[PDB]
């Protein structure tokens, strides 16, 4: 016939055994039929103590030795999987002790069980030749006939022919807890001496558990488990006719209100459901008998099954399960913009970093800031009444201070005649992505909508070019590496880039001043913008292109928007002279700069929104004055 | 007798002329915008009057000619030869953030879409503007960005983030059609200002399964939405790369223009459980909505916290088809949020199968900062696949356990939540949902032979003027959410059990609205016993043979229950015998010169004068 015995094999994952001092592979689809061949009598002349298969190989290689055999090197090879003969690993007695292989030749009276090849002194030694496949060891006692009594070894003693070996029944160590699901041992026999099938297998029962799908429960080769929370662990039967069976195990040796988790480990005195109906006790099967018994693990609403809510049988006969769902489970500002107005018991920044210690923080504050002469340490409340809300100092040497998160209440391109050093050509993937404006010898600004990747070792700054790629002026261009990005306050969407090295100034390269922090604009005031971005023209030579705009109030802006937006002070609105011309793709982060009387400074930044350069429609820009002091307080870095 | 009195039930069939509109072709999607119903359909697109249900206008993406030489939008009219295929509108969305636009999509044109703009003077004409979202990729012809619409599966989610239009699209794809056009499972197509193409912000902006599995492991997408910056998805796929079963999953991730950073999938199962088990693999339709006040307590939220509703049907063995057995399931977003974040241990959480492949560097020795990380964008994202599911008790307890449910919508009224179930075959019901008890369908009638589409539109202006739009086959219907009528009710019990927002009251003869009682006998409060028959009609003062009493409204009405203790039965002066085990609100049993027989039920009484000595 053709039978299965891999179920009697063990397995291990992603290891291959290399016996340095020695065993053949034949391409066979089924590692399981492979193990069955290894077991099946006379299959190979050598002593197939285990097997290994690699489904990448699909080559079937029996190994006539254990890993406990000396000198064999395991190797973490994913494709290779071992399958051990659990009999050599039993080291105990199952039933008759019929199939033993363990290396023990000690009698019950502590005598060495003779070499079974030794005719001396006792006659019946010829067995290993006679009984081949029983692993009739050199000296170690085996159960030659599958005798009830077990391995009985012909003692070397002159007086006694054989003394029976004694090996414990395996369950001596296979104990259990009342839950039993925690226990994950070797005992792979049912309560009727039946054997559990391999949990990876789908035959003869294709049950629900896929050990990889439900790992962490020890659904290893055949080992009894409690997956469904029975008082006893149980397994699906190797026999197709038995659906499944319990596993015989002995026992082992040696509450509050607020809810944790789904209440499973949690325990409760309360057993009134949201309907108010009290629930009855575990003994009291009434009104309708319940399976759960104290043997499984008062009249309380516990979670023995670990349901979403602990559940107790309504004394109402109609309802089987009632949910005591009133149970409690253990589980920001408005119009106050200055930090002192709120006491923030919060230790985090907006970056997610924790706070720092308010002592050195306080000292550095007083040193840097003498604005005025309270709060707790390491907490969201901030003294300096900062407009962008509550903040906290940070332990980072790169960044010392960050806000803590509490909510409170160019189309028609006209090219530039000459060069502007304020512009910065951001090259990611080695080409311009957005405009940036230089303020310090070591600081540029642009918008947060301009940045795919979070690193720096991709990005690049290009400096002092009138054409897109330094195509004309290879004499004066210069490229810099990126040291840091800084993300602005909430809803700011303003990112400040420091380069790896400040770029020493020159005629061509120009930094820009900041607007007056509290300043207000005059309406229609002409200003200018510069970009290499999309303009709609047939052929962009790569030149910088300049356009002029004129300030305007909220009115006409929302009017052309027809109420698309209700403005905010963050926003600055400026518009064209009834013509279709405005920033578009590739211009983002471009500057709009203006002068008080002659000295010109940035006032807005190109930000993408709501369509490109629709004629007679105003654009919305950032209020640089709305952030200038924050930019300074960070320029402290 | 019980079947003889089957007239007790409200009739399943009651035909009504509804606001109805017929389609030449099967309907694929629907959009509501400015009192106008835009609906894509087989090779076509239509507009409807919101009140008039009248085709204001329409346009044809009609019989589609395909040429292998042809690009989606390059002209191929002059061509003399070829496939003669048919675009089905798989993706459809109106956008307002830039302009008043409709983004429509063809299935066949390499899955490449178009746009149609609306004038202000008249705001319904679409034949004006046709524009192809077809950005030529001179840079990297590796990836066709505007090739968006998959043929096999399209779930589209449009939003405005960081002042840009973003499309999160989930796509079912076969491995075979990959070389013909390379596409992605889940991709984030961001729409350029110039509105002439989409741009992939990076390489990690797109996710799709390893080229090996793309024959097996079919993952098809069924729903998505936005809430709390987590753009969840509902979709079915294999339990495992080997399982060949299917379990419906919910996916969560954060929305940064770049791409899906913290990508999480969790299994979701709905179980109908009893004392001392049926699990629905396959979600059929869903709807995320606010809860009714009674539901807010019963499941644990406010009137504003968002609850996701999933109508799940049990799957055929090793197959994603349903076993015609469905229920519905509620999921507070708070609970799923916390399950993703904190509840799960550190041993469970796995790496994605279909993306990483089991044999990898990262899956071997990589972990999470679960309690120390939520929505954090780290440049090395970890695709996490929780092994422990979230499972819900059916709120219905199988009040439809014998049937499949094609679709669902949700709405609430006052304190209650009422679900507008669509039946597998197309028997639209409206049913109050509560943990209390089963609610009968105050409407149940059969709409049409064909399945009800999961495409369903809900609206309640002022919570007074309200309606849903429902698709089936080639017709859409505007069903007011305000009920239809009380007359079909055929018991005082059934009449009273109706919701208040339908005005139900027995007019001494049948349930009715108050004003229609000419006799003014309109009552909603006392349920008089009604006799159908008596078996037999001849009895002695001592001789006793079984006494079968057919009728209705016999039991005392408690809010749900109908109690037979609260009843007395008299034979004139002599009280007739009550066999409560054999006596129910439908039928009664007794054991004992013309005489009448008086029932005294929970509310009223009656006499029956067909009896003698």
Residue numbers in the entry:
A (entry chain A): 34 to 55, 59 to 290, 302 to 344, 351 to 384, 389 to 430, 434 to 469, 495 to 722
B (entry chain B): 26 to 107, 111 to 304, 311 to 626, 634 to 654
Give the text the authors published on this PDB structure.
C-MET receptor, which belongs to the receptor tyrosine kinase (RTK) family, plays essential roles in controlling a number of critical cellular processes such as cell proliferation, survival, motility, and morphogenesis. C-MET can be activated by its cognate ligand—hepatocyte growth factor (HGF). Structurally, the c-MET receptor is composed of a Semaphorin (SEMA) domain, a plexin-semaphorin-integrin (PSI) domain, and four consecutive immunoglobulin-plexin-transcription factors (IPT1-4) domains in the extracellular region, a single transmembrane helix (TM), and an intracellular KD. HGF, the ligand of c-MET, is secreted as a single chain 83 kDa precursor protein containing an N-terminal (N) domain, four consecutive kringle (K1–K4) domains, and a serine protease homology (SPH) domain.
Subsequently, we applied a focused refinement approach on the particles used in the reconstruction of holo-complex to improve the resolution for c-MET I and HGF I, resulting in a new cryo-EM map with resolution improved to 4.5 Å, which allowed us to build reliable models for the K3 and K4 domains of HGF. In one-half of the holo-complex, N, K2, K3, K4, and SPH domains of HGF I are arranged as a C-clamp shape that packs tightly against the SEMA domain of c-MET I. Totally four interfaces are formed between c-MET I and HGF I (denoted as interfaces I, II, III, and IV). Interface I is formed between a short α-helix in the linker connecting the fifth and sixth blades of c-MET I-SEMA and two short inter-strand loops in the N domain of HGF I. Interface II is made between the fourth blade of c-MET SEMA and the K2 domain of HGF I. Three positively charged residues in the loop of HGF I-K2, Arg242, Lys244, and Arg249, interact with negatively charged residues of c-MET, including Glu267 and Asp352; while residues 249–252 of HGF I-K2 make close contact with a surface formed by strands E and F of the fourth blade of c-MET I-SEMA. Interface III is between the SEMA domain of c-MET I and the K3 domain of HGF I. Furthermore, a long loop (residues 300–311) that links the fourth and fifth blades of c-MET I-SEMA adopts an extended conformation, is tethered to the K3 domain of HGF I, which largely contributes to the binding between c-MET I-SEMA and HGF I-K3. Interface IV is mainly formed between the second and third blades of β-propeller in the SEMA domain of c-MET I and SPH domain of HGF I. To confirm that interface IV is essential for c-MET activation, we introduced Y673A mutation into HGF to disrupt this interface, and showed that HGF Y673 mutant has a great deficiency in binding to c-MET as well as promoting c-MET activation.
